[PDB]
Curated annotation (Swiss-Prot), chain A:
This is Proteasome subunit alpha type-6. It comes from Homo sapiens. One of its GO terms (cellular component) is proteasome complex. The modification Phosphotyrosine is found at Y156. Gene3D superfamilies: Glutamine Phosphoribosylpyrophosphate, subunit 1, domain 1. Glycans are attached at S2. SMART domains: Proteasome_A_N. PROSITE patterns: PROTEASOME_ALPHA_1, PROTEASOME_ALPHA_2.
Curated annotation (Swiss-Prot), chain D:
This is 26S proteasome regulatory subunit 8. Component of the 26S proteasome, a multiprotein complex involved in the ATP-dependent degradation of ubiquitinated proteins. This complex plays a key role in the maintenance of protein homeostasis by removing misfolded or damaged proteins, which could impair cellular functions, and by removing proteins whose functions are no longer required. Therefore, the proteasome participates in numerous cellular processes, including cell cycle progression, apoptosis, or DNA damage repair. It is found in: Cytoplasm; Nucleus. It comes from the Eukaryota. Belongs to the AAA ATPase family. Component of the 19S proteasome regulatory particle complex. The 26S proteasome consists of a 20S core particle (CP) and two 19S regulatory subunits (RP). The regulatory particle is made of a lid composed of 9 subunits, a base containing 6 ATPases including PSMC5 and few additional components. Component of a complex with USP49 and RUVBL1. Interacts with PRPF19. Interacts with TRIM5. Interacts with NDC80. Interacts with PAAF1. Interacts, in vitro, with the thyroid hormone receptor (in a thyroid hormone T3-dependent manner) and with retinoid X receptor (RXR). Interacts with ERCC6.
Curated annotation (Swiss-Prot), chain E:
GO terms for cellular component: cytoplasm; cytosol; extracellular exosome; nucleoplasm; nucleus; proteasome complex; proteasome core complex; proteasome core complex, alpha-subunit complex. It comes from Homo sapiens (Human). GO terms for molecular function: ubiquitin protein ligase binding. This is Proteasome subunit alpha type-3. It holds the Pfam family Proteasome_A_N. The gene is PSMA3. Belongs to the peptidase T1A family. SMART domains: Proteasome_A_N. The lineage of its organism: Eukaryota, Metazoa, Chordata, Craniata, Vertebrata.
Swiss-Prot record, chain F:
The chain holds residues 17 to 152 of 456 of the full protein. The gene is PSMD12. This is 26S proteasome non-ATPase regulatory subunit 12. Component of the 26S proteasome, a multiprotein complex involved in the ATP-dependent degradation of ubiquitinated proteins. This complex plays a key role in the maintenance of protein homeostasis by removing misfolded or damaged proteins, which could impair cellular functions, and by removing proteins whose functions are no longer required. Therefore, the proteasome participates in numerous cellular processes, including cell cycle progression, apoptosis, or DNA damage repair. Coiled coil: none annotated. Component of the 19S proteasome regulatory particle complex. The 26S proteasome consists of a 20S core particle (CP) and two 19S regulatory subunits (RP). The regulatory particle is made of a lid composed of 9 subunits including PSMD12, a base containing 6 ATPases and few additional components. Interacts with ERCC6. It is linked to Stankiewicz-Isidor syndrome: A neurodevelopmental disorder characterized by delayed psychomotor development, intellectual disability, behavioral disorders, mild dysmorphism, ophthalmologic anomalies, feeding difficulties, deafness, and variable congenital malformations of the cardiac and/or urogenital systems.
Length: 242, 208, 230, 38, 240, 136, 69
């Protein structure tokens, strides 16, 4: 943990080879206090996050961390709300530019690979700070199938069978690692159930059909849709009955 | 096509082992077209399974003759797969203690294949195994000649783990020749080489 | 943007920020490159911290042209930037000469980019070292590009974590008469000494270059090579 | 110091075999332990 | 400690102090409340007069960024006016490009990104004002968004920004805002402002009122003086 | 807790008549739903009575394959009360003594000795079953 | 060796883990595995107890970001 100069104030290397500013951006994801869980099945991908409405004054229809980047690609944002919208707006622009320049919908893997490239510049140039947000894109590829990609402030990116971001990321990761070890190609119903269960078990909330948001993409309909409270209640009822 | 008989051979595993052989061995005789990325993968899986089954049945003609028959096929699959095939087929025959009398012959044939394919690491372990086979066949004089050559090659590349084994074989061979002073020197070489590296429990046991 | 250099000379005549960038390289995943007589091999430890990670989603060994490949040790995001720059640089060479870019020429162009970030304003050096392998004029090529921007022609080298002992291991295990397949065997052996746990076909990445060009070995192929180790 | 430690370890190997006189094997086994192992 | 001198440096706990410090300027200004009723949005700002010399209308915290969108500000007034011009030019550009009045959701999402762009670099400082944007249309309906110095835009039914925001929010929660109309809300908005005002503390406030709803044909206008005085009288009577 | 009690006092005699009539597969499912309610409610005196009822139902109906499957399924049920299983095993080991057919008796013991393996609260039944198995 | 285990537990699953743990940590894993069996009124330690015990005892925060390698 040695320091020499401005290694803690700008994105420059520490004596042991560390970028503290980039590391501090990771602790910024937990500032919102929300956890997101994404699970990929045999033919579907599901993103689940908790929505907190502290007062009835807030319009709950607006407090959403689920964003439709394009028709076939959706994402869940964790971290600073202000930084999250900029990444979503940036991701939407790159998706639209890819469609215009190349003539086909941008792949999920290449969407963050661009976004991780933008966020890498923030970790190399010192006049701006890294965006304290985490991006998890889910979408149905033409050939590879369902895809899940986490997109961290450091410019790192990787595919995931089931990932999580937020305060309870490592608690939820251990839960999802156990479920994946069983090696079950979950159906659409099971992926939503394990995604809701992962957020439910880790947080111990026993979710109501107003406290989480579910966004799913399926092979049958490769479009990103937000689950309504009626649709979300069916899965919660199914969880309770089993 | 060919995959179906593999499951049928797998299903026949619960049945008589020899009954399953006719399925796998027919695939082994089966001729192949230019590439057949599925067929060669099945035959490679069948031949590895066929030899594995014969490790329990113990039939030298179909096992020892297999290695002499599949030499043309080794020129089709990738070199990494072929070297594994040669290693696996040879290892099963020699782990079978039955001294059919040709154990020296095909081991030397594989060494020639290793020389032709320029696989030094595969060759060196085969030569080291041959020295053990020479010792087990009372061929002490040739064992020392091959062990002496392997000692120099192993020393240059600092392969201490394999150096200990061949040195121990030299110590055992000299002991059988009733030459205690040379047996102690070879064992001294093996012990000092062993002390310089981490000895696996099998290697420490044979040294002790 | 900041117009002043963030890398400066220490009173004892050292670019201190470059040395700290090299420390990040030493903390990265090990990468081993061996130049055999008939080709070059590139191997690295692509081990993830969980099974949830998709191994095949992100590849540490990436091709640049039909005959040039990259493998790194250091910061993952920094390597993707250098991959795009190298691929951009290879296209610029190809467009104006209509000939695939020589392996040596690419290293100079890539190292120049790395050197620029040492002297340019408001930026930090790349925290990676690039192992560049290629095939030109019927002769194998292997190079290393440090964060400083200095490129070395290596017959056999290792970078990343435990690279000092890996270099020593290659000293006693490499000769100019090694073949491509034995180089793969030696490259896997070099990783194994620095490797913790067990090496599967998914937690390591191997890429080789020969007359046929550079291609990254599939997990099926790496499994066959790994079987010879044990 | 390493050369001195090799001699001290050489006498240890004689004790491990309950010998009184240090033999050449003991020095060689001490060299391997001090240099290569450590 | 040096971790709070720039917006481009993260605290070791991952918080941007310059943005947090800019939020404190909003918490030092007078409260400004906005309530979204069934058929519109009513804006009420407690506008103190620092001296009797300022004219009735000086330091107008209620702006008109478009013919259908209002703006109630809190914090530093200069950055509030600058953001009002940014919101003004965002609505003008939207009409000059797409051909219709800009939706509040897009306007809030557009101005917030400009606000957020000032929270990333050391070359600029975060805006020291928080503002509420309200609009009404027959199609979209009454909308109310609050944007803080960080750049977070959330839709609201009742929002308060300023030093008495926390006390004002409690009074807003009593209201059944989803059912009453603008004419009834303007009385309550005055009542909440008068309740949260501190007479022993900074006193002599002027009640600034504005609304946009179906009664104004979706046009943001200053509340008429005749209704405004009626709301003022009701608020004063409610204090007994 | 919720004290189901009399709730199972109504179902158990009713499903007993359907069991003799010929309805067993549908009946046990109704008890399984009733067991699920009582298990979650942690009703001890209730949950035992269904568990002994199902094993008795499959024993009186000579449903040996169903009896062994039900024993394994009931014992592995999520968060099942430990004393509820003890009563079910206690009533089941009595059926072992009554059963004279060796292949049927052996398989029931093997299933019973497997659901009681490693569990303290049924250690006496497992020992006694091993003595019965050893005697056989 | 002093504990009543089941044949279903494979110690190599937890030995192969790359966690840098001490002998007291390994004792705690076995000690915590035995208490989970005790909690469920069991005198034989199952494989599920060891998996829960290992996760509880180690409780290792990642403390390392993937972008460094």
């Amino acid at each position: 943990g040695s320091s020499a100069g401005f290694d803690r104030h700008i994105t420059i290397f520490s004596p042991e080879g560390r970028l503290y500013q980039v590391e501090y951006a990771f602790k910024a994801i937990n500032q919102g206090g929300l956890t997101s869980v994404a699970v990929r099945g045999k033919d579907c991908a599901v993103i689940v996050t908790q929505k907190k409405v502290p007062d009835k004054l807030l319009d709950s229809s607006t407090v959403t961390h689920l964003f439709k980047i394009t028709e076939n690609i959706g994402c869940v944002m964790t971290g600073m709300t202000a930084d999250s919208r900029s990444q979503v707006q940036r991701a939407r622009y790159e998706a639209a530019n890819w469609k215009y320049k190349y003539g086909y919908e941008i792949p999920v893997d290449m969407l963050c690979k661009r976004i991780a490239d933008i966020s890498q510049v923030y970790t190399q140039n010192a006049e701006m700070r890294p965006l304290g947000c985490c991006m998890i894109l889910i979408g149905i590829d033409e050939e590879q199938g369902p895809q899940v990609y986490k997109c961290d402030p450091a410019g790192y990116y990787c595919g995931f069978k089931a990932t999580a971001a937020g305060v309870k990321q490592t608690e939820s990761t251990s839960f999802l690692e156990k479920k994946v070890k069983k090696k079950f190609d979950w159906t659409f119903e099971q992926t939503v159930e394990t995604a809701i269960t992962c957020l439910s078990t880790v947080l111990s909330i026993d979710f109501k059909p107003s406290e989480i948001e579910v966004g799913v993409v399926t092979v049958e309909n490769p479009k990103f849709r937000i689950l309504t409270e009626a649709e979300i209640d069916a899965h919660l009822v199914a969880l309770a009955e089993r | 096509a060919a995959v179906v008989e593999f499951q049928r051979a797998q299903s026949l595993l619960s049945t008589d082992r020899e009954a399953s052989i006719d399925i796998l061995h027919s695939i082994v005789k089966r001729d192949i077209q230019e590439n057949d990325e599925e067929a060669v993968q099945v035959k490679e899986q069948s031949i590895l399974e066929l030899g594995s089954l014969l490790a329990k049945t113990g039939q030298a003609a179909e096992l020892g003759g297999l290695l002499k028959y599949v030499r043309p096929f080794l020129n089709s699959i990738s070199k990494a797969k072929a070297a594994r095939l040669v290693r696996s087929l040879l290892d099963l025959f020699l782990d079978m203690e039955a001294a059919t009398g040709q154990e020296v012959e095909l081991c030397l044939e594989c060494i020639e294949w290793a020389k032709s394919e320029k696989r030094t690491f595969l060759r060196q372990a085969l030569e080291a195994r041959l020295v053990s086979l020479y010792f087990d066949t009372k061929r002490y004089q040739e064992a020392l000649h091959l062990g002496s050559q392997l000692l120099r090659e192993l020393k240059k590349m600092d392969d201490k783990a394999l150096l200990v084994e061949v040195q121990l074989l030299e110590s055992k061979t000299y002991h059988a020749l009733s030459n205690l002073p040379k047996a102690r020197a070879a064992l001294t070489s093996a012990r000092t080489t062993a002390n310089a590296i981490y000895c696996p429990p099998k290697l420490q046991a044979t040294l002790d | 943007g900041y117009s002043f250099s963030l890398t400066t000379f220490s009173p004892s005549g050292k670019l201190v920020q470059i040395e700290y960038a090299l420390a990040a390289v030493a903390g990265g995943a090990p990468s081993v490159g061996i130049k055999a007589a008939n080709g070059v091999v590139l191997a690295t430890e692509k081990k993830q911290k969980s099974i949830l990670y998709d191994e095949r989603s992100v590849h540490k060994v990436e091709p640049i042209t039909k005959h040039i490949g990259l493998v790194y040790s250091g910061m993952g995001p920094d390597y993707r930037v250098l991959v795009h720059r190298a691929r951009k640089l290879a296209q610029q060479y190809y467009l104006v000469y209509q000939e695939p870019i020589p392996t040596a020429q690419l290293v100079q162009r890539v190292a120049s980019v790395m050197q620029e970030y040492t002297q340019s304003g408001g930026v930090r050096p790349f925290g990676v070292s690039l192992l560049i392998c290629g095939w030109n004029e019927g002769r194998p090529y292997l190079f290393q590009s440090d964060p400083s921007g200095a490129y070395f022609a290596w017959k056999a080298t290792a970078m990343g974590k435990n690279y000092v002992n890996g270099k020593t291991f290659l000293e006693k295990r490499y000769n100019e008469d090694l073949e491509l397949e034995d180089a793969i065997h030696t490259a896997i052996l070099t990783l194994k000494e620095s490797f913790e746990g067990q090496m599967t076909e998914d937690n390591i990445e191997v890429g080789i270059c020969n007359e046929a060009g550079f291609r990254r070995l599939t997990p099926t192929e790496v499994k066959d090579y790994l079987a010879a180790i044990a | 110091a390493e050369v001195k430690g090799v001699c001290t370890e050489a006498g240890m190997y004689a004790l491990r075999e309950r010998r009184v006189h240090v033999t050449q094997e003991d020095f060689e086994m001490a060299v391997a332990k001090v240099m290569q192992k450590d | 400690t040096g971790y709070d001198l720039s917006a481009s440096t993260f605290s070791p706990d991952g918080r941007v102090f310059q943005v947090e410090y800019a939020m404190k300027a909003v918490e030092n200004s007078s409260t400004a409340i906005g309530i979204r009723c069934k058929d519109g949005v009513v804006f009420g700002v407690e506008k103190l007069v620092l001296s009797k010399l300022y004219e009735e209308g000086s330091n107008k915290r209620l702006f008109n960024v478009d013919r259908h969108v209002g703006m109630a500000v809190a914090g530093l007034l200069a950055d509030a006016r600058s953001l009002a011009d940014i919101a003004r030019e965002e609505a003008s550009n939207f009409r000059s490009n797409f051909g219709y009045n800009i939706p509040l959701k897009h306007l809030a999402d557009r101005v917030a990104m400009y606000v957020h762009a000032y929270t990333l670099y050391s070359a600029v400082r975060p805006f020291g004002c928080s503002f509420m944007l309200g609009s009404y249309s027959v199609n979209d309906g009454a909308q109310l968004y609050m944007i803080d110095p960080s750049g977070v835009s959330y839709g609201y039914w009742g929002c308060a920004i300023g030093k008495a925001r926390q006390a004002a929010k409690t009074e807003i929660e009593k209201l059944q805002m989803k059912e009453m109309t603008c004419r009834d809300i303007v009385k309550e908005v005055a009542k909440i402002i008068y309740i949260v005002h501190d007479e022993v503390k900074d006193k002599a406030f002027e009640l600034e009122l504005s609304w946009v709803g179906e009664l104004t044909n979706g046009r943001h206008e200053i509340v008429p003086k005749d209704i405004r005085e009626e709301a003022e009288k009701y608020a004063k009577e409610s204090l007994k | 807790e919720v004290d189901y009690s009399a709730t199972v006092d109504q179902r158990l005699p009713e499903c007993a008549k359907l069991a003799k009539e010929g309805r067993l597969q549908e009946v046990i499912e109704t008890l399984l739903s009733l067991e699920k309610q009582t298990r979650t409610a942690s009703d001890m005196v209730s949950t035992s009575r269904i568990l002994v009822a199902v094993v008795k139902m499959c024993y009186e109906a000579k449903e040996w394959d169903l009896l062994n499957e039900n024993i394994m399924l009931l014992s592995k049920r999520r968060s099942q009360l430990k004393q509820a299983v003890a009563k079910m095993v206690q009533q089941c080991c009595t059926y072992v003594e009554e059963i004279t057919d060796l292949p049927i008796k052996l398989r029931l013991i093997d299933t019973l000795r497997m659901v009681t393996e490693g569990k303290i609260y049924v250690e006496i039944e497992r020992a006694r079953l091993t003595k019965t198995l050893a005697t056989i | 060796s002093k504990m009543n285990l089941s044949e279903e537990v494979d110690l190599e699953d937890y030995v192969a883990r790359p966690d840098k743990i001490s002998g007291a940590d390994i004792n705690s894993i076995c000690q915590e595995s035995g208490m989970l069996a005790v909690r469920e009124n069991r005198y034989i330690v199952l494989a599920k107890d060891f998996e829960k015990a290992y996760k509880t005892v180690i409780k290792k925060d990642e403390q390392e970001h993937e972008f460094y390698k």
